[model samples]
Target: STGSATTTPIDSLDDAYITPVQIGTPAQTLNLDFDTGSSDLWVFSSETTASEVDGQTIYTPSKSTTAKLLSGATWSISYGDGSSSSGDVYTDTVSVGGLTVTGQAVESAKKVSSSFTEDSTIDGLLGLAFSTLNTVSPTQQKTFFDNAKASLDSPVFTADLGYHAPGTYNFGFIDTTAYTGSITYTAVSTKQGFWEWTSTGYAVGSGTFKSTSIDGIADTGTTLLYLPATVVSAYWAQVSGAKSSSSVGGYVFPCSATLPSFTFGVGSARIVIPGDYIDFGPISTGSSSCFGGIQSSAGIGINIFGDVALKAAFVVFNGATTPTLGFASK
Candidate 1:
């Protein structure tokens, strides 16, 4: 079995990648952000705080005959940014594109942070990361990907993210037409429940590629690419009037500045991120200074190669017991 789903960016900055998911008996359709950094498929539901609900869609388990409450089970997930959500658990028939899982864990959000509420673009999140990161208590639950892997023609999935456009996520087999060159493969250590891999090196703009080992996670949930301060500084240094500002968070540069391309290596493959992608729009709507798409992951222990980097390449998340990540230019 296999499936292909279209993923769309919320805005020009590509803040989030949302995919449509069908849940329960009658198939309540919801737009869910596919987050590779998380492991819980949570949604704004009927039990959510009324005041906390905004313009987002809600999932009503009572209306779905296929929904089954997972009694005594609860989950709470908090992020480094201090935003969080917690809720009750239910199992329902869930489908993405054409693939269906009859008993997929679906968490219903009872409470949401202001940050999540303010963002009306997403109804909830569909986690694609390893199930080891699931926050469910009593017994950790498997991710949608994990449960469907055994039934899939191939235990693998691929991502082709677009820049301010729609892209496709393919499950079960690689889409040969989605990429331009041979994919370069690298080992993935799911020991920490992330699509964690090591990059051979990187180069700022057209600078010579440096030979160094850079460990990071390929996170689709995160909006920006975060690297070591040293690497971040190098990339920003090339931009005039670019400086770190705590008042606005991270580094910001003149929107008028000519941005440079960023390059990273996976095995022998080098994928180049276009300058436009590095310029992550304005700090505010039409603001002169734009926040960088790449920032320092200083406080966080691990570097994150998020949507900013993933958009530039065709990525493969091999779901075999011995997982591996593949990167190729599109």
Candidate 2:
């Protein structure tokens, strides 16, 4: 909860992940998606005219000879898959890995569809999460910790939400040998930038729920992790042979042979969500099974904890001094 150390440590590799920031002397490279939900730092330019900008990543700045444009500064972005883009505003000389963030504030898009650039390894998006979910709204307001937090000296920011094998979101400082020291620092609930979660109920396999008082809010740009519908039909009426054939229901079972465990109540601190991380994209012969942390929501601000509840914890996003969210050690 302090600032300056550059603290740039991100390592998630299924291959292809670039990081560079020094947008003034020319060194622009971006590809990091760390969102405690959203705070803006998107890329894809080259004065995009957008007849079609598919799957993301497209920034040219006239193909960067040392791009710099902040003229009248204008931009527009909309994605829940409505696919949008707006342009005008640039400044380059960005560098990462050596950490140089000068004059660094960028955005340019006339239009783009929302598919995330057919994974050329996704070459854009690094909004280190926290500036009140800004997608560079309406003119020149910046964040990357508000312009590199006064030239980082040790600003202490950590968001290591990974589950195994190169799964990362790790930002600025604070590793502490990856928390073997029982990490838990939660005190930033004046409520402003939604990461708000206070659910104290629901469990399947091992069966547990303290009187069904379900509460919600923990979005990471929603990939479907919603709850509260009679606590999702009172936990599929208790799994054992659970069957409720989707009225937009939550967890379906019968992969036969146990394999079901879900837990989420982060106040009294209990986090166990493993049933193959709630079955993401696979298995289909229709024996039925889709359990992934209580689903279903087209209402109530559409509940979320996307990226599978941040791959089960190790997230920290301290806005340099207050506005904290540190919970690593699991």
Candidate 3:
């Protein structure tokens, strides 16, 4: 059957969006991050140590009559931000929005890193990447989307994220009302377990669009937009008081600076990120210094068009032989 789900940002921190998912037979709901960057449906569970689970809710599989442990199976995952989690496995009925997938692999976290414990808001991550990226040891696992694709009207999903507001993630079919104009399609390279693509060129502010190709991945889990070092340098140069301060981490500028918009080319489509969006909040609360959302991706080798970039348009993640990405003006 066709299915859809709506996700909302956590408060003013639009860094991540969380969707309520029901797991187990009787159904235990948990707020999860629908991450396209990783492939693993893990949650804070009863198995988690008390010290590691802060104020987050835990999933109790034992209470679910349909929950079954996957003998000898365990999973572990780590993120670029140094956050990590490891857990045992269970086969359970998992449901997102109105769609249900039975016999889904549900990784129950027994241990979580400080980064996760501190967040308190996120229960776990619902990975949307290729199943090959799954971290289940000894045996690989299939993602919920993969398992439900056969029953879906269309093997596709759409991400509509807003700036400091709620957004929606629709599955199985695309909603034309969510975006405006034509949805431009681009080829994706899934070799790296990501929705990777190359932009035809980019423009700093309203400056001329440079005909320079930049390769990057569209990541919903990441908070800021990251580009090449030279590109970052060029963008920041337009901001009067911008500086690459190690103390502030990434590029920072005076909060009152007149920032410029950044645009990237996708085929013939130009996705422009507003100037205010580039000013990714203050470096810290009550501080006059702000961090530039677009920074250098030099450390990671690959640039990332994170939430900052993704929020600028309505995006389609198409699962086809070549796996294409469609972008449209929001």
Q: How many residue pairs clash in all the candidates, one count each?
A: 0, 34, 0
Tens digits of per-residue lDDT for model 1, 1-330: 998999999987798889999999899999999988889999999999999999998999999999999999899999756889999999999999899998899999999999999989899999989999999998899999999999999999898999999999888999998999799999999989999999999999989999789999999999999999999999999999999999998999998899999999998889999999987878988799999999999999999999999999999999898999999999
lDDT of 2 at 249: 41
Q: State, as a TM-score between 0 and 1, how close model 1 is to the true structure.
A: 0.99
User: Per-residue alpha-carbon lDDT of model 2 for 1-330, expressed as tens digits?
Assistant: 232222222323212233333343344455544445555566766655554555445666776776667777776656443545556667665555555565666666565455554444444555554565565535545666657665665554554444434433333566667655465555554254555545556576677656444434444444445666555565556556655555534456655535465676655566666655555431344535644345655454545655555556666666656665556546
lDDT of each: 0.93, 0.53, 0.89
Error of 3 at 81 (Å): 1.0
Give the CA lDDT, 0 to 100, for residue 51 in model 2: 47
Off by over 4 Å in 2: 1-40, 43-89, 92-101, 114-126, 129-150, 153-155, 158-219, 226-293, 296-314, 317-330
Query: Can you write out model 3's per-residue Cα lDDT over 204-235, one digit (the tens) per residue?
Result: 99799998888888888998898999999999
True lDDT of residue 233, candidate 2: 60
Model 2 local distance difference test score: 0.53
lDDT of 3 at 8: 81
Write the number of the candidate with greater TM-score, choosing between 1 and 3: 1
Error of 3 at 13 (Å): 3.3
Show where candidate 3 strays beyond 4 Å: none
**CA shift of 307, model 2, Å:** 8.3
